[PDB]
């Protein structure tokens, strides 16, 4: 759907390959660069969230 | 703490190192001029740890 | 967890009864009718005062932008200032009954407490009748402002092992604190909660491969390849050139970085000298108890940009306090005062 | 201002502006009918003879007056000026240090390896393997991934089809991706792929698939020693027909960085067959860093 | 371009009130679209827009999820102008793609 | 003094989900599944004919073979199973055939 | 574009600070380039980027001297919306030089 | 408060699937499937288990 | 054989094939990949209900 | 484009001036035409501008009823954009025309 | 039956292989934590290495 506000559309993306995988960033504690003006409390392991 | 000057063989560090004697740490020190002269120690084995 | 628009995903709630259930004390007539007697007393007045007491005052930043906010009148009792950013995406507009621009379920950072955005800050500067500095008594290690991070650090003005500079880490420890002073040790566990500034300060460090050495290549999203065949996967075992070694005496040289990240922090500047929070009313704020004149003040945020439209939270604090009156059998009598930003009309 | 002492922002303690009935009702009650936070304290800070108000800093940096660097200790002299009325405790003043560090080839901050994690530790990684005799052509164990129609010039790969509807043959230094080909596992399964290509090691040193490691040569992903020429060998598996395999063989300088060996082959037939068989390890990781609280810096 | 200096001038207080986004495509109570403040179709009042999924207007898409979240209005503006780009781009695309069809007719045809 | 105490996950199964979304492919020791050899082939004039002494090759065209595992399920219903299902009690379980108890 | 009054705003005072305006490559003390304030480079901090006359970040161009003084960061902006009208119109020349030697192509082939 | 809510169709409890999960992604579920002619009579890509 | 309506209400399709050449071959190699999860919930402390 | 509150500063009060407003056509007393007060044409002050109906500058059109009510000035604006747009849009149509006449050729020729 | 030679039946339950997973990373984890650690005298160097 062109909304892309919708589970469906937000669901239905893939990610691209590169950014992030075991080798990135080894050795370090870094958060992606790309991930950090995101909602770290969107998450699906939002454990109060999940409660 | 390896992790705080990051990864790679190379690196660049800006720490902050404390008083650690017990008559200095915690002296008032009162209105004067004092020289504050130290020495750092450079033995690459005392400094890091694997 | 997806901030997915739920109206337009089918979801509905039906709400069929409403009721509250009050829990009274029981307690002797006797003395409840004593107790009630010296609390309908015009000098037993119960005293409230909202927790987070402030102002707030939201601003919006177009993408990829600075900000120049100025209010424009007297500061009696002022308390200190708590700055955040917010993406308009996720703040509703609740002034209005319904908002069908929202559009947007999850945390909403504004009336939830969900702060991640508090670290792409890079200055701030504070300026009183366009003339005066508020903190210009050559205080900070940098007087005309403060800098909450340096992209550069030619000088020596960092702090721990992060971005920050050691006169906003100051400034943060003393706010929330008292610490700075006296040394900097790790404040007790019943002083560092959620909203605090320790729990929530991570540093971080990464260090790059110095895409300046000779024979270096900056490669695409598409030519970076590692495990190539082993998405369903598919290819055939290959040699590598993934993520260049950083360690072994194969190194490409090196380039460090660094960056901190705090997640639920409100960036507080105290109305006070120095820095403390040594009571309610600051040092300054009954300064200026006098009347003596009203100060129009000038305010600057230079900040990280980001893509999508975000917005600025200032949170102008003050004293908001409420005395409730019952002069006699269930009449309520409610005055109220907010006295560095008031609302009597 | 009475507004604030109405408000008891600053007027005074509740225990000491409440009716002395209230206060001893509510210290009486308070175990079971807790009253005292109905009520306001000003706690008001004191307003004068705490601060300066007249100039002075916060933050001093004092720069060595001079130094020393022996290659075995850094002493530096500082002379610190305690303003003249101004007092600190040295509870501060702690040493800024500035500096590069190389942490040396023992620096190992992960466990496990970082290019080929999921391959298989003894496996090969397109090796072209010499035979016994060692005057035969060496024979490959590449495997064709990616899938195409060979013809045109020297029989390239079928990569794709440029603006007019023409035949695109492959870039010889990285354009048989690694990467790219048969997805879906009915291809090559079910129905039968006629022709594929891939990439091949040429004299090589022999490594396992585990480290493989090779640094780029041009901008596009591709590895090759320089001034090193790429060559293409065909093979089918049927005699007297059209050839199914293209391989573009190269030579790399082929690294293992960050795995070491385990049950290594001698040198003497590592190259040509058995070690193919050579399984790498992880390499034991180091975590070089700075001692606790700094200690022995001093 | 030169100087640009985002964000020149003071900014005035975020309005509480709703609306005040210029080209959001808002949602209805019961899900729906709701057309932009900046829209013609809040001149004036429709009674059925809420309690109402399907839209009542001439502007925007009939189902909530076939509604882009930006709608485009005001071709002056910079949405417009990057629309008009966008427009021109494909129309430049199928421009080569009807000659890289007329040359393979035309290479067929001689040979 | 160490109390006994059940493990908050097991008295109370909580099936927040598996997230296995992404496959596991376990792969052969050899990389390339050694079979069927191949002959190396070269073009002399129009034809193709085989080069001299070259016929141990092991080329397998096509994806590797793999085989699918699921690991964070298995290792869900593992720890479920271990946990739940062997302490069900006695009514709900039933001795194996050819068994004697 | 019609009832336009360039700043109708109150312009508010300049900061006394470095990283005002929105897109201007830079020099360090070495000469090298630094990144416009708005790049997604000073999210941290790369402690080397002073004393080198190389660029230490992956953005930009790698020589001082081969860096244009204003570059583009902001697809959305003015300056993306220019850069892809420069790129359509050198499309459209191409278009035209291709259609032109076709042209040729086909009168050769005629006569 | 009391009432019914129907939190939409988007709701999803859990990670993962519930209903196939060790079965692989990729796998066909013992379908039948045509040919490229399609005059054909579909195949099966079967297993007979019992 | 026979006909049933099997759905995927668990999982979406990544890499599916075009649907006009989906019931023949290479239709078989579709996997799928399970949905995001949501938790759709009330509020922290109920915030937003008032 | 997204997040876009139209107006979002402080508007100053309109200057009661005659030249306020940007790239506007005006007029003189004797029905004349005069250049927008951001023509390079008001730097200096000619002497006769005001009296006569032809303009005495060299940029804008020879006769009040041949000249554009609004002028586009500074091609970096958006109107300097809006008419490169229509430029290419032309040119992109008569390439078209053009693609079409030797297509049409093409099959006469094949004839 | 006429030009219906593409069926691919395989009798029986499905090939699988057993792999004993809990068992597996138990064993990872003892030998990377504890035998790596052993004194050297424990430890042998394998043939065909320099060190």
């Given at each position: 759907?062109?909304n892309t506000?919708?589970?469906?559309?937000?669901?239905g993306?893939?990610?691209?390959?590169?950014?992030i995988?075991?080798?990135?960033?080894?050795?370090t504690?870094?958060s992606?660069?790309?991930?950090?003006?995101?909602?770290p409390?969107?998450?699906?392991?939002?454990?109060?969230?999940?409660? | 703490?390896?992790q705080?000057?990051?990864?790679?063989?190379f690196?660049?560090?800006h720490?902050?190192?404390?008083?650690?004697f017990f008559?200095?740490?915690?002296?008032?020190?009162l209105?004067?001029?004092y020289?504050?002269?130290?020495?750092?120690?450079?033995?690459?084995?005392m400094?890091?740890?694997? | 967890?997806?901030?997915?628009?739920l109206?337009?995903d089918?979801a509905?709630?039906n709400?069929?009864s409403?009721?509250?259930?009050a829990?009274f004390?029981?307690?002797?007539?006797?003395?409840?009718?004593?107790?009630?007697?010296?609390?309908?007393?015009?000098?037993?007045?119960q005293?409230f005062?909202?927790?987070?007491?402030?102002a707030?005052?939201?601003y919006?930043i177009?993408?990829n932008?600075?900000?120049?906010?100025?209010?424009?009148?007297?500061?009696?009792?002022?308390?200190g200032?708590?700055?955040?950013?917010?993406?308009?995406?996720?703040?509703?507009?609740?002034?209005?009954?319904?908002?069908?621009?929202?559009?947007?379920?999850?945390?909403?950072?504004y009336?939830?407490?969900?702060?991640?955005?508090?670290?792409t800050?890079?200055?701030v500067?504070?300026?009183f009748?366009?003339?005066?500095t508020?903190?210009?008594?050559?205080?900070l290690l940098?007087p005309?402002?403060?800098?909450?991070?340096?992209?550069?650090?030619?000088?020596?003005?960092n702090v721990?092992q992060?971005?920050?500079?050691?006169?906003?880490?100051?400034?943060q420890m003393?706010a929330?604190?008292?610490i700075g002073?006296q040394?900097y040790?790790?404040?007790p566990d019943?002083?560092?909660?959620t909203?605090?500034?320790?729990?929530?300060?991570?540093?971080?460090?990464?260090q790059?491969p110095?895409?300046?050495?000779?024979?270096?290549?900056?490669?695409?999203?598409?030519?970076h390849?590692?495990?190539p065949?082993?998405a369903?996967?598919?290819?055939?075992?290959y040699?590598?050139?993934?993520?260049?070694?950083?360690?072994?005496?194969?190194?490409?040289?090196?380039d460090?970085?660094?960056?901190?990240?705090?997640?639920?922090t409100?960036?507080?500047?105290?109305?006070?000298?120095?820095?403390?929070?040594?009571g309610?009313?600051?040092?300054?704020?009954?300064?200026?108890?006098?009347?003596?004149?009203?100060?129009?003040?000038?305010m600057?945020?230079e900040?990280?940009?980001?893509?999508?439209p975000?917005?600025?939270?200032?949170?102008?604090?003050?004293?908001?306090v409420?005395?409730?009156?019952?002069?006699?059998?269930?009449?309520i009598?409610?005055v109220?005062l907010?006295?560095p930003?008031?609302?009597?009309? | 201002?009475?507004?604030?002492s109405?408000?008891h922002?600053?007027?005074?303690?509740?225990?000491?502006?409440?009716s002395?009935?209230?206060?001893?009702?509510?210290?009486?009650?308070?175990?079971?009918?807790?009253?005292?936070?109905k009520?306001?304290?000003?706690?008001?800070?004191?307003?004068?003879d705490?601060?300066?108000?007249?100039s002075?800093?916060?933050?001093?940096?004092?720069?060595?007056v001079?130094r020393?660097?022996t290659?075995?200790?850094?002493?530096?002299?500082?002379?610190?000026?305690?303003?003249?009325?101004?007092?600190?405790?040295?509870?501060?003043?702690?040493?800024?240090?500035?500096?590069?560090?190389?942490?040396?080839?023992?620096?190992?901050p992960?466990?496990?390896?970082?290019?080929?994690?999921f391959?298989?530790?003894?496996?090969?990684?397109?090796?072209?393997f010499?035979?016994?005799?060692?005057?035969?052509?060496?024979?490959?164990?590449?495997?064709?991934?990616?899938?195409?129609?060979?013809?045109?010039?020297?029989?390239?790969?079928?990569m794709?089809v440029?603006?007019?509807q023409?035949?695109?043959?492959?870039?010889?230094?990285?354009?048989?991706?690694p990467?790219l080909?048969?997805?879906?596992?009915?291809a090559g399964?079910?129905?039968?792929?006629?022709?594929?290509?891939?990439?091949?090691?040429?004299?090589?040193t022999?490594?396992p698939?585990?480290g493989?490691?090779?640094?780029?040569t041009?901008e596009?992903?591709?590895?090759?020693?320089?001034?090193?020429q790429?060559?293409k060998?065909?093979?089918?598996?049927?005699?007297?027909?059209?050839?199914?395999?293209?391989f573009?063989?190269?030579?790399?300088?082929?690294?293992?960085?960050?795995?070491?060996?385990?049950h290594?082959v001698?040198?003497?037939?590592?190259?040509?067959?058995?070690g193919?068989?050579?399984?790498?390890?992880?390499n034991?990781?180091?975590?070089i860093?700075?001692?606790?609280?700094?200690?022995?810096?001093? | 371009?030169?100087?640009?200096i985002?964000?020149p001038?003071?900014?005035?207080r975020?309005?509480?009130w709703?609306?005040?986004?210029?080209?959001?495509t808002?949602?209805?109570?019961?899900?729906?679209?709701?057309?932009?403040?900046?829209?013609?179709?809040?001149?004036?009042?429709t009674?059925?827009?809420?309690?109402?999924?399907?839209?009542?207007?001439?502007?925007?898409?009939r189902?909530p999820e076939?509604q882009?979240?930006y709608?485009?209005?005001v071709?002056?503006?910079?949405?417009?102008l990057?629309?008009?780009?966008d427009?021109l781009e494909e129309?430049?695309?199928?421009?080569?793609?009807?000659?890289?069809?007329?040359?393979?007719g035309?290479?067929?045809?001689?040979? | 003094?160490?109390m006994?105490?059940?493990?908050?996950?097991?008295?109370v199964?909580?099936?927040?989900?598996?997230?296995?979304?992404?496959?596991?492919?376990?792969?052969?020791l050899?990389?390339?599944?050694?079979?069927?050899?191949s002959?190396?082939?070269?073009?002399?004039?129009?034809?193709?004919?085989?080069?001299?002494?070259?016929?141990?090759?092991?080329?397998?065209?096509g994806?590797?073979?793999?085989?699918?595992?699921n690991?964070?399920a298995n290792?869900?219903?593992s720890?479920?199973?271990?946990?739940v299902?062997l302490?069900?009690?006695?009514?709900?379980?039933?001795?194996?055939?050819?068994?004697?108890?």
């Amino acid at each position: 759907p062109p909304n892309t506000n919708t589970y469906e559309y937000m669901n239905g993306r893939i990610p691209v390959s590169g950014l992030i995988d075991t080798y990135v960033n080894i050795g370090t504690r870094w958060s992606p660069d790309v991930m950090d003006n995101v909602n770290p409390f969107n998450h699906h392991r939002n454990s109060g969230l999940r409660y | 703490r390896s992790q705080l000057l990051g990864n790679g063989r190379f690196c660049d560090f800006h720490i902050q190192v404390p008083q650690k004697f017990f008559a200095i740490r915690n002296l008032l020190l009162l209105p004067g001029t004092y020289t504050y002269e130290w020495s750092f120690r450079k033995d690459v084995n005392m400094i890091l740890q694997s | 967890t997806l901030g997915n628009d739920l109206r337009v995903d089918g979801a509905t709630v039906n709400i069929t009864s409403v009721n509250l259930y009050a829990s009274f004390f029981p307690m002797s007539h006797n003395t409840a009718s004593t107790l009630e007697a010296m609390l309908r007393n015009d000098t037993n007045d119960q005293s409230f005062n909202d927790y987070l007491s402030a102002a707030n005052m939201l601003y919006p930043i177009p993408p990829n932008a600075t900000q120049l906010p100025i209010p424009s009148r007297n500061w009696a009792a002022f308390r200190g200032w708590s700055l955040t950013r917010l993406k308009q995406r996720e703040t509703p507009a609740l002034g209005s009954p319904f908002d069908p621009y929202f559009t947007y379920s999850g945390t909403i950072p504004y009336l939830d407490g969900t702060f991640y955005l508090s670290h792409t800050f890079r200055k701030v500067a504070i300026q009183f009748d366009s003339s005066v500095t508020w903190p210009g008594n050559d205080r900070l290690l940098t007087p005309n402002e403060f800098e909450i991070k340096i992209s550069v650090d030619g000088e020596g003005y960092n702090v721990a092992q992060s971005n920050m500079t050691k006169d906003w880490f100051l400034v943060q420890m003393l706010a929330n604190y008292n610490i700075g002073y006296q040394g900097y040790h790790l404040p007790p566990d019943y002083k560092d909660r959620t909203f605090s500034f320790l729990h929530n300060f991570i540093p971080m460090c990464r260090q790059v491969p110095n895409p300046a050495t000779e024979g270096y290549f900056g490669l695409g999203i598409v030519n970076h390849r590692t495990t190539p065949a082993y998405a369903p996967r598919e290819g055939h075992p290959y040699p590598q050139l993934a993520l260049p070694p950083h360690w072994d005496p194969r190194h490409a040289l090196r380039d460090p970085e660094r960056k901190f990240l705090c997640d639920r922090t409100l960036w507080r500047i105290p109305f006070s000298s120095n820095f403390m929070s040594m009571g309610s009313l600051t040092d300054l704020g009954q300064n200026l108890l006098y009347a003596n004149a009203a100060h129009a003040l000038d305010m600057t945020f230079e900040m990280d940009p980001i893509n999508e439209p975000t917005l600025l939270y200032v949170l102008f604090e003050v004293f908001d306090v409420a005395r409730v009156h019952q002069p006699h059998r269930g009449v309520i009598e409610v005055v109220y005062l907010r006295t560095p930003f008031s609302a009597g009309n | 201002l009475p507004q604030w002492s109405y408000m008891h922002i600053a007027g005074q303690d509740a225990s000491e502006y409440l009716s002395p009935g209230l206060v001893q009702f509510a210290q009486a009650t308070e175990s079971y009918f807790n009253i005292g936070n109905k009520f306001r304290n000003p706690t008001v800070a004191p307003t004068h003879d705490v601060t300066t108000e007249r100039s002075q800093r916060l933050q001093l940096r004092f720069v060595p007056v001079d130094r020393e660097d022996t290659q075995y200790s850094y002493k530096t002299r500082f002379q610190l000026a305690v303003g003249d009325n101004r007092v600190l405790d040295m509870a501060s003043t702690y040493f800024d240090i500035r500096g590069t560090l190389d942490r040396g080839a023992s620096f190992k901050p992960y466990s496990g390896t970082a290019y080929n994690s999921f391959a298989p530790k003894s496996a090969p990684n397109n090796t072209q393997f010499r035979q016994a005799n060692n005057g035969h052509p060496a024979q490959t164990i590449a495997q064709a991934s990616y899938v195409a129609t060979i013809g045109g010039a020297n029989n390239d790969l079928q990569m794709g089809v440029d603006e007019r509807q023409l035949p695109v043959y492959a870039n010889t230094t990285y354009q048989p991706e690694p990467q790219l080909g048969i997805e879906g596992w009915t291809a090559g399964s079910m129905a039968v792929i006629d022709q594929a290509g891939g990439r091949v090691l040429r004299n090589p040193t022999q490594t396992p698939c585990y480290g493989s490691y090779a640094k780029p040569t041009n901008e596009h992903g591709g590895i090759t020693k320089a001034n090193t020429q790429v060559e293409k060998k065909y093979y089918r598996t049927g005699d007297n027909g059209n050839p199914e395999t293209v391989f573009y063989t190269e030579e790399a300088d082929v690294l293992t960085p960050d795995t070491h060996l385990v049950h290594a082959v001698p040198a003497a037939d590592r190259a040509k067959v058995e070690g193919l068989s050579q399984h790498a390890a992880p390499n034991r990781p180091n975590f070089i860093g700075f001692r606790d609280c700094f200690v022995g810096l001093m | 371009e030169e100087g640009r200096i985002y964000v020149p001038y003071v900014t005035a207080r975020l309005p509480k009130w709703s609306g005040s986004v210029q080209d959001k495509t808002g949602s209805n109570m019961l899900g729906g679209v709701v057309l932009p403040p900046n829209s013609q179709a809040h001149r004036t009042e429709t009674v059925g827009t809420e309690a109402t999924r399907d839209n009542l207007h001439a502007e925007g898409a009939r189902r909530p999820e076939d509604q882009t979240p930006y709608m485009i209005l005001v071709e002056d503006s910079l949405g417009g102008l990057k629309r008009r780009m966008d427009l021109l781009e494909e129309s430049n695309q199928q421009l080569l793609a009807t000659l890289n069809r007329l040359r393979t007719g035309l290479a067929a045809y001689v040979q | 003094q160490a109390m006994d105490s059940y493990d908050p996950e097991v008295r109370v199964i909580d099936n927040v989900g598996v997230e296995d979304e992404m496959p596991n492919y376990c792969f052969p020791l050899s990389g390339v599944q050694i079979g069927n050899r191949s002959h190396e082939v070269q073009r002399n004039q129009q034809q193709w004919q085989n080069v001299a002494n070259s016929d141990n090759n092991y080329i397998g065209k096509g994806n590797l073979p793999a085989m699918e595992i699921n690991l964070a399920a298995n290792l869900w219903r593992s720890f479920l199973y271990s946990n739940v299902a062997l302490y069900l009690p006695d009514n709900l379980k039933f001795t194996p055939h050819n068994i004697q108890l």
